[PDB]
Amino acid sequence: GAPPIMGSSVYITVELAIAVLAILGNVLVCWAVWLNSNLQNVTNYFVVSLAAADIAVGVLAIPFAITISTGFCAACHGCLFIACFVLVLTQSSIFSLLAIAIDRYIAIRIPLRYNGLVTGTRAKGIIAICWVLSFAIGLTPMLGWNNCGQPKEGKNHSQGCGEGQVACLFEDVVPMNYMVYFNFFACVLVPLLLMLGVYLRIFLAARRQLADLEDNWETLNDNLKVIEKADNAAQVKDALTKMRAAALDAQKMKDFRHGFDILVGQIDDALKLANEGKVKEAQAAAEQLKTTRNAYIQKYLERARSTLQKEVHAAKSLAIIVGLFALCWLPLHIINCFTFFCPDCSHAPLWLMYLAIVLSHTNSVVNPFIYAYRIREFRQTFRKIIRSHV
Ligand SMILES: CC(C)CCC[C@@H](C)[C@H]1CC[C@H]2[C@@H]3CC=C4C[C@@H](O)CC[C@]4(C)[C@H]3CC[C@]12C
Ligand SMILES: CC(C)CCC[C@@H](C)[C@H]1CC[C@H]2[C@@H]3CC=C4C[C@@H](O)CC[C@]4(C)[C@H]3CC[C@]12C
Ligand SMILES: CC(C)CCC[C@@H](C)[C@H]1CC[C@H]2[C@@H]3CC=C4C[C@@H](O)CC[C@]4(C)[C@H]3CC[C@]12C
Ligand SMILES: Nc1nc(NCCc2ccc(O)cc2)nc2nc(-c3ccco3)nn12
Ligand SMILES: CCCCCCCC/C=C\CCCCCCCC(=O)O
Ligand code: NA
């Protein structure tokens, strides 16, 4: 077998390349949110916490990963910290990603209550709490769920380690049942399936809300046709009742309210004439709704449709971030599953183990590119920062 330093040099060089890109890209994200008030919303406070976790991957986790690949002799609980710290940052990333999904779900389901419910203060408290929990979850092996009590005495003696020391290798100190059941199934897989369900509900809400907008609009126009060719006052009354309900329903901002005030007032005018049996005069009054429809109602329809389409597109951009997180981390989890569940299968080869580790670290590079390609407000802030400075 080739000298280990050769393959190790490749892995270390690649890790350092990734640490540099993770730092720069996510420093740039944080710098953008700090400078641009348009980016200073509650959603982006989770984006920032997520960016800080990825900066920490380059500053600390990658240097730790480089250290543990050497198998150096170390006290077992110090080895555990080196080995498990990255699990803290990944758990924090899960919480930030989940809060973002719930944040956007709240914004599309109850937008009028959003600013009263989701505030910057409460977001900070949630973020602080999630970091605490991430340390508890990620460092759970440091509380006794480890293999420090069953050291590899063959490795420790050949490595020449001292009293209470072990050859510091990830799979010799971290239990695989912890990695599969606790970390993967419970703390990663379950939150990802929840995020999937949240985003599905976000898209269902938008689809259902866009459909109501268009259904109310068609109800308005169809009933105008009904009124125009109606043959008696009663056919006009029934047509006008179905419009008044749609008018009040669509009403549930200065020029918006004034438009529906005009609309409802004209319907009531036509309704009163129709109750008095004045057919032609009711039809002529109902015909004046077209003015209001073209001047006010069409502009509100188009503006409400545009907001909803923006929320769909934004939700897609954030879902892509969740999907790249899964793409980058699942191979490592899936390999552990094979290692744990198939003791009769050969262990995955070393070159694959480190490709899977490298892939997981690349996730801390991608998020700033998604923002730059998919979020105009980030892309524009990135340009101004770059060309004003570098
Ligand atoms: C706040 C940031 C900048 C500082 C990070 C401190 C890091 C580098 C420190 C904190 C605790 C330290 C570990 C504590 C215990 C041991 C056991 C010892 O037998 C080998 C070194 C090792 C594994 C240390 C390595 C370096 C270490 C991980
Ligand atoms: C999210 C996507 C990319 C999932 C990718 C699936 C990857 C991780 C899967 C697909 C095929 C899998 C390999 C199939 C066969 C073996 C032989 C066994 O003795 C050890 C595990 C090993 C080497 C598997 C490791 C994990 C593996 C490489
Ligand atoms: C992320 C979604 C797709 C579900 C998670 C995929 C994981 C849990 C699935 C996909 C493929 C599955 C593996 C397929 C084959 C084997 C070999 C068997 O001898 C032990 C179980 C094991 C190792 C499975 C464990 C669970 C597994 C890794
Ligand atoms: N299984 C595993 N191994 C390692 N490193 C050690 C790789 C290795 C595996 C076997 C061997 O004989 C020598 C080295 N880091 C690892 N990190 C993770 C991880 C992080 C998140 C989910 O899994 N799993 N994982
Ligand atoms: C911006 C923060 C940068 C932090 C410093 C980065 C340079 C350190 C990176 C890797 C050093 C790895 C230390 C080698 C482990 C010791 C090997 C051994 O004891 O056998
Ligand atoms: Na991350």
From Swiss-Prot:
**Main location as per UniProt:** membrane
Which membrane topology describes this protein?
Multi-pass membrane protein
Query: Which modifications occur after translation, per UniProt?
Result: Ubiquitinated. Deubiquitinated by USP4; leading to stabilization and expression at the cell surface.
Extracellular-side positions: 4-9, 69-79, 146-175, 342-349
GO biological process terms, alphabetically, are: adenylate cyclase-activating G protein-coupled receptor signaling pathway; adenylate cyclase-modulating G protein-coupled receptor signaling pathway; apoptotic process; apoptotic signaling pathway; astrocyte activation; blood circulation; blood coagulation; cell-cell signaling
Q: Which residues lie on this side of the membrane: Cytoplasmic?
A: 35-44, 103-122, 201-317
Please tell me one Gene Ontology term that the record gives under cellular component: dendrite
Disulfide connectivity? 73-161, 76-148, 79-168, 342-345
Which amino acids does the record list as binding adenosine?
A: 171, 336, 360-361
Query: Example GO molecular function term?
Result: calmodulin binding
In the UniProt record, does the keyword RNA-binding occur?
no
The alphabetized UniProt keywords are:
Cell membrane, Disulfide bond, G-protein coupled receptor, Glycoprotein, Membrane, Receptor, Transducer, Transmembrane, Transmembrane helix, Ubl conjugation
Does the record carry Cell membrane as a key word? yes
Q: Which residues are glycosylated?
A: 156
Q: Where are the transmembrane segments?
A: 10-34, 45-68, 80-102, 123-145, 176-200, 318-341, 350-373
Instruction: Briefly state the protein's biological role.
Output: Receptor for adenosine. The activity of this receptor is mediated by G proteins which activate adenylyl cyclase.
Entry's free-text remark on domains: The cytoplasmic C-terminal domain is necessary for targeting the non-ubiquitinated form of this protein to the cell surface.
Report the sequence similarity comment from the record: Belongs to the G-protein coupled receptor 1 family.
Protein name, UniProt field: Adenosine receptor A2a
Q: What is the lineage of its organism?
A: Eukaryota, Metazoa, Chordata, Craniata, Vertebrata
Its gene is ADORA2A
